[PDB]
Design a binder for this molecule. Structure first.
Ligand SMILES: CN1CC=Nc2c1nc(N)[nH]c2=O
Ligand SMILES: CN1CC=Nc2c1nc(N)[nH]c2=O
Lengths: 269, 269
């Protein structure tokens, strides 16, 4: 249908036409008296990954950045979690990092997808890591300023700069996913505007991931704290899917999997 | 903006451009040892109308049809509820009836809007009641068979037949609201198809109400019982709003008011 290839994630394969793919956000709370890999913190992560699998998640997102942490210490946290989760939960894993070295150890430890909040712009070598291991990479829209001439024209220009960095490093078109970076470098009004105009990202010819779960633009509209943002997140997931997004990144996996599934049936996905 | 008039409901006025209007469904459980108007059953209804008002409802929908009931007995139930609710809760009231005589007493007892599941086709005199009291009337799509040549072409043809009955009786264009009658005379697949194509109803030039709350097409997609249909209802409300509907008729007023509000901000309503 829309996509003439599947997303290839080593042992796992994700069909981009059958359904909206749910990326569950692993809650990753560090042990205070620990250097990483301790029992309480890895056990908590594994229990949460199993719950999210049981609730309809298709991908488990894991990041290493409570306590301030260096690149070495970021690796010592994330690597044992990736090892335990990939052994114990049979889903592809994405590593949430903008650092080449973290991306590399995370993949060597078992991660399948790179999730980069700086779209290969903070550390362009991450795209070389992606190109060598032949993994999918999510290039998120971000910048270090909010000075838009024209929000969507500018986001598309910036995403294309990320695509260029990734292609010049030898990333294959099939391993590129884009993300409008909701809640990054954008005022609450720009986030609403990006949501209203999300379908424009489809001209670039790549699958789009949307991440809106619990973000402050929803609290800004509803005047509700982070724990009362489920309905608002749901509205953003539904619009995202109606505008053609292939993945949503969410905390409330059970509720959002049911909304995604209803949306899919109505739109004929 | 889209609408150059407000919906005029006697003492209350509903702006059709500011926001999606939430019609809350009054739960109307009859007393078993009672003829209507008893304390337990009217008190339950009033408490539920106050809760729904506090939760973001803009209209309270009240119907009279547990125990089997005649036209006279339908009036004895609905009339005391309308009287108490209209005295105690300051929102417009719609009367859910396809019967001319029930519509008439309900308005005389205080109801502001007629909600007709047969679109003036079961009892065409209801449109004369509507025309005399100068109240808004919701004409829902319904039929006594599922023999569609072409679902949407046919729904639009049938709605237009309702509009004709209503205009010939002297109903003013400003007092007409349409509704695609989701869950009426339609298979679960036709309900999905009507949802996918809802924007077509906008060619008729009238405000549209959508009622999907907890309906079996959602249980059919999600394989979930009536008490576990909140997320699925939410997806239908969101798509409905994205496709231009002015009202949604819902049981879960708190959750759906928050979803409607998020949707409004994203689409620029
Ligand atoms: C890694 N994070 C953190 C917060 N939000 C996001 C994220 N990654 C992606 N791809 N999209 C997001 O919205
Ligand atoms: C009165 N009822 C009962 C069940 N569903 C509906 C209804 N009225 C309208 N307008 N729309 C509905 O979907």
């Amino acid at each position: 249908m829309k996509w003439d290839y599947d997303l290839r994630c080593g042992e796992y394969t994700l069909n981009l036409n059958e359904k909206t793919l749910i990326m569950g956000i692993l809650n990753v709370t560090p042990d205070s008296f620990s250097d990483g890999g301790s029992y309480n913190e890895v056990d908590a992560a594994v229990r949460h990954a199993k719950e999210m699998r049981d609730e309809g998640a298709h991908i488990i997102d894991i990041g290493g950045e409570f306590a301030k942490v260096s690149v070495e210490e970021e690796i010592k946290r994330v690597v044992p979690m990736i090892q335990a989760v990939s052994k114990e939960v049979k889903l592809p894993i994405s590593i949430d990092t903008y650092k080449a070295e973290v991306a590399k150890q995370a993949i060597e430890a078992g991660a399948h997808i790179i999730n980069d909040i700086w779209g290969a712009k903070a550390e362009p070598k991450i795209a070389e890591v992606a190109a060598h291991y032949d993994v999918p990479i999510i290039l998120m829209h971000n910048r270090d300023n909010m000075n838009y001439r024209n929000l969507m024209a500018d986001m598309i220009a910036d995403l294309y700069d990320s695509i260029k960095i990734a292609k010049d490093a030898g990333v294959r078109d099939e391993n590129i996913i884009l993300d409008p970076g909701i809640g990054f470098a954008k005022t609450p009004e720009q986030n609403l505007e990006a949501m209203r105009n999300l379908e424009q990202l489809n001209v670039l010819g790549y699958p789009v991931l949307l991440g809106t779960s619990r973000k402050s633009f929803i609290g800004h509209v509803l005047d509700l704290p982070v724990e009362e943002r489920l309905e608002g997140t749901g509205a953003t997931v539904c619009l995202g899917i109606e505008k053609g997004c292939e993945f949503v990144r969410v905390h409330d996996v059970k509720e959002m999997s049911r909304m995604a599934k209803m949306m899919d049936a109505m739109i004929g996905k």
